[PDB]
């Protein structure tokens, strides 16, 4: 809720400083994604609705202990609000913080030799709309940028020309460019007037929807509740 | 054994899977009221010798005043309506214009986003598979009305397996010269000029006798939920023009003479129930887009 | 033949009238209390018996 | 010698001869204006964000207000409506509603039940019949647009025989190359893409020529008087609905696929000036079953 | 309508007297009275709600021309309200009376040769409510007196329990019987319970509540008459009054 | 060719076509609602030691109030909801009660007589027949489970239909030992203990082996629409309560087991759709026959 509610560059960027690995993580098994089911939408249909699993669904699925594992957990964080099951990732990880992981050469994982045709492909990029495409660039390109390999980001962007007209403006080294961006990544948010309670076709479109309408109650019953947890307890 | 499909059957590509949240359906349905405003003004302001109401139409519309010197594009309204449109049709479109924006232009009017108070009929016929035996020829032509041509060059008379789909309602079929047809391990019936069928019941069989070739001409009717404000002809007039103007231009797409053609192909893909509210979200944007164009040309 | 003229006009305040929406709510108090007199009275006195 | 004819001519069923006095004209009348108040009020109401105005509606065409778990499906006009329109059809229709019923739906709106206001246009083609020699063989295909394929494997030129009725105003034939064609006892003139006819000036001879096939397309145009309030787009769509949803399954009947064909056939036929005027009758009622029907949706898929 | 509102026998027989044979007949087509038919019922099934058509129903149905037919078109105009369809009946027959034609020998009917068990069966007997099974009673018994045919009206009632218990008793002569009888003969009235404006399955249901809603409408109609408001407005004849009488009796 | 069928289902006598309107279908759910309350007044009398909860309902069921020197029978109310029930199970029964009286009583209470507002799961199994070659024995037993057994004496395996008709929703198929069975014209599946099937697609084929006999369980599940109000238990209960009662003692009926085989055998006739309607109604009428014959035993 508070990752998909972040309407900025600087706000998201400031929320991976302070959140722990072990938010973008789950500890709930799931199901093996890229599965063709059939749900129930009893609003619309008698019959019943054929869907996708997807990684980007926000819905825990199982996930591989590689490095690409825990990249792909990380992104789904970022564009759905929930991460996948990667079994013992470890003590030494899990306190680390997520912009750490993705920028940092202190936390022992090496993440060259990455591939971004094969992540995006795994994570539905043709599925995800122009917020969730942003918002996966930028993991892209802080992962780029610190190992070294700008030109593969640059390569990556000329194959796919969707995606190189909404690409991040912003250079990680540079704070200045972090400063002066205006992308809009506010998956959720409070909305003028209000929203039905009414459900979508889709798996992503009614967990998305989920995520929104519950927002405003989030948003006015989150600081007693979190501080009574706080209260008397060191942070990961 | 020999096969013969409908021609605007084959291979559905895949549609987009963007703008179909209630946000986006409300932008959609502002858009064709507004539109529809725009059409209204236009004739009012030709009546009444004055351009106040065209002003102050073009002015919610496009958010800005008409000027004698710039051209009248429609403002951001029309350039998001272009988009949409674009992302509608095919999975590889861009699908650029943000929330925000979205949200934006569906607060200008109050009207609800639901696509499924109402019912259109979409008079297509779909002929998934016609099997004919050996020295049997079977030619299948059109779409709104599909004239099946067989004749047999063998002894004997031969047996012809009709498949409609499990998707259509009603299948009226009428025949040039009086022929039997029954469903499977069904008795023939006499020769009679017309039948009347509903495609769920299982594979039908026509006897083809030797000699003269016969001509059986089909006719189906479909109800598809769609919006109250859905209007056949305004939706087949905006899809013309939106093929006409480019916006169907992607990679690896099909194309389709008219909607209704569009829209029950993608109903009988292998699981069409999800593409049929894309399609008729999409309906609902030409039919805005027509109106749109047909007050302010380009 | 004598028909007096009802102008009603202040009354209005744009399309609101603001005392017969507010007497139509007192029926609410209303009902609330038939509702809460009856059950009192049913508990506390029970079946009658003449 | 060989005899064809459209296949959407052959066999017209008989039509009810129940609800055509004045009375029950009304009553179709009365739903058709209520039945578009119907549709009118529930796209206001969607743009008003209130309910009010379909509920308004809703109560001057069901009489009663509904209750939300309750299916709204029109009331007693609809059950009335949905049941006049199966007699119309056919003969055997069992024709069950009461006359009381049909006064009283009747008087709730002052509309007259009038269906000879106006005219429209029927584009059907009727070719009763077309006479070929021995050696020549013809097909006749399509409604609205009849493609006659006739090829002359005969060693001469051939003289086919086209009867398109009495009925039609106006036939246009064209063909996919010139052709050769003229009334009966006639000289021939040259050859012309386009003929335009009169049906009632007689049936008409084509020259077939030895070698490639001639395929002449036609178009027909007839007029038949209608209500004020028809429309022919509504009509079709409520025809459509109505075969869809199980109203016409009735014994020994005829299917036709558009009320097109339906009008046309009942026209070309013994007595069709009385079958005529219980048709339109029809097709305004269809009119009213569809606009009734698309405010308030049943069937779910 | 008129005739299934009213309650005594005093007020039916009344009816019966004003009324002219030729509200019994309907001058509509119709159709054929028993058949199975397929019906349209949207409120309850999407499917087509199967039924049997009757004699006794609120529609015109074709009848036999025979005095047999114009017996039976009589019962059921008392019992749903709509008669049959006899076509070419002569014009003096359809200015008497409908009591006339049941008690009185100077119309040309014959009547003599009539059964009443095939009567019963035609004008289905088994679907009847008990308010309708005692209006037929009634109609039987003033064509048994008028015919001297009392001996077969008492085999037909010992014959069948039911209707024997239930049979009015009033003596077709005498006035004094009629004032006596305390039954109950209303198929609409104003409903104690709730009615609403829903549609029934049967055609004899539907038809019915046809009816019923259709008398509250006219209760509250300015056509209806009310004795206690505007009883000084009525005529001296149709006044309600003690010694009111019908022509002989 | 031998032909097997449930013996519950054959010859379905008419019903009743008497006190199925608005007024009718209201006094059944007052009778209901009153003899619930007579029941609940039993305990209500035992918390206190008055009987006054129990007279001031009887006053209310039967319009009298109670006396020690006679036995409760329910005035009024008991002797309409006995003649009534027996009017709905047979055409041949009077309909004894008047109007006038119904619609007094229907008075007493302000229920709506709605039977359309939820449904029942009846598991009844409709077996229409089952169609055998020359040298098999099929044996068909129950109602509620089927067990067929079936018997193969001669050289080669045999098929064996099973129409289980056009109404149920559900069946299932469990095996003593794994069996084949396949739609008609579908490739036979592998043996498996349990089969499920939809009635509606069509009649099934059964392979059966030459040795030890083939013995098949049957449970089926029919959704039929009813009344809120409506209670299985009870209603089974007043129909054997009626039965004992004499209150279907008339000539040319036929009996059965349970509600639940009536039910299903009406559905299951020529014109069945329109059987059900009263037979939901007289199952009301008996679960209040239950509730009420159990207070005041005669």
């Known amino acids: ?50 869907d996708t699993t997807s990684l980007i669904d926000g819905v825990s699925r199982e996930g591989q202990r590689n490095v690409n594992g825990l990249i792909m957990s990380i992104i789904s964080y970022v564009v759905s609000g929930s991460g996948h099951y990667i079994p013992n990732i470890g003590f030494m990880l899990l306190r680390r913080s997520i912009l750490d992981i993705l920028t940092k050469h202190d936390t022992g994982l090496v993440t060259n030799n990455l591939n971004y045709g094969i992540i995006a492909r795994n994570l539905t990029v043709s599925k995800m709309n122009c917020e969730q495409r942003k918002r996966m660039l930028i993991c892209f390109k802080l992962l780029a940028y610190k190992d070294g390999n700008q030109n593969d980001y640059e390569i990556y962007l000329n194959q796919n020309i969707p995606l190189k007209q909404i690409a991040p403006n912003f250079i990680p080294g540079d704070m200045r460019t972090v400063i002066h961006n205006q992308d809009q990544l506010a998956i959720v948010g409070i909305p003028a007037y209000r929203l039905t309670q009414s459900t979508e076709l889709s798996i992503r479109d009614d967990n998305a929807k989920s995520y929104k309408l519950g927002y405003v109650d989030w948003y006015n019953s989150n600081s007693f509740l979190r501080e009574r947890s706080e209260f008397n307890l060191i942070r990961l | 054994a020999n096969r013969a499909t409908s021609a605007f059957l084959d291979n559905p590509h895949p549609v987009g899977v963007n703008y179909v949240d209630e946000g986006s359906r409300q932008f959609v ?60 049709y095919s999975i590889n479109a861009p699908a650029i214009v943000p929330q925000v924006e979205i949200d934006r232009l569906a607060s200008k009017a109050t009207v609800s986003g639901d696509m499924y108070n109402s019912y259109a009929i979409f008079n297509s016929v779909p002929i998934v598979e016609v099997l004919s035996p050996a020295r049997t ?82 006719t189906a009717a479909t109800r598809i939920q769609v919006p109250l404000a859905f209007n056949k002809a305004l939706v087949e007039s905006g ?43 999409l309906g609902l944007a030409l039919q805005a887009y027509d109106q749109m164009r047909r007050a302010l040309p380009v | 033949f004598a028909l007096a003229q009802i102008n009603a006009d202040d009354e209005f305040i744009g399309a609101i009238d603001k005392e017969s929406a507010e007497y139509l709510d007192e029926y609410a108090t209303l009902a609330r209390d038939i509702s809460n007199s009856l059950t009192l009275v049913k508990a506390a006195f029970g079946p009658l018996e003449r």
Do not use: W
């Not at chain 2, 480019?246 to 999800?274: K, R």
């Open chain 1, 1 to 50: 809720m508070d990752v998909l509610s972040k309407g900025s560059l600087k706000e998201l960027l400031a929320h991976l400083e302070k959140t722990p690995l072990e938010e973008a993580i789950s500890y709930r098994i799931g199901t093996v994604p890229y599965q063709n089911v059939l749900i129930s939408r009893n609003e619309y249909y008698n019959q019943l609705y054929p």
């Open chain 2, 29 to 88: 349905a502002v858009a064709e009221l507004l539109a529809s405003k725009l059409i209204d003004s236009s004739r009012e302001s030709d009546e009444s010798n004055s351009d106040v109401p065209f002003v102050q139409a073009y002015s919610k519309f496009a958010d800005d005043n008409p000027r004698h010197l710039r051209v009248k594009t429609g403002g951001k309204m029309a350039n998001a309506l272009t988009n949409v449109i674009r992302s509608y």
């Open chain 2, 137 to 218: 020829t079977v030619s299948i032509v059109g779409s709104d009305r599909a004239d099946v041509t067989m004749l047999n060059t063998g002894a004997g008379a031969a047996n012809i397996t009709f498949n409609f789909g499990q998707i259509a309602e009603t299948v009226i079929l009428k025949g040039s010269v009086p022929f039997q047809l029954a469903r499977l391990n069904q008795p023939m019936p006499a020769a009679r000029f017309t039948y009347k069928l509903r495609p769920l019941d299982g594979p039908f069989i026509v006897v083809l006798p030797v000699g003269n070739p016969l001509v059986i001409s089909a």
């Open chain 2, 239 to 281: 899809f013309q023009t939106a093929m006409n103007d480019g916006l169907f231009d992607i990679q690896n797409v099909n194309y389709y003479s008219s909607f209704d053609e569009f829209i029950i192909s993608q109903y009988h893909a292998q699981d069409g129930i999800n593409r049929v509210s894309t399609c008729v979200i």
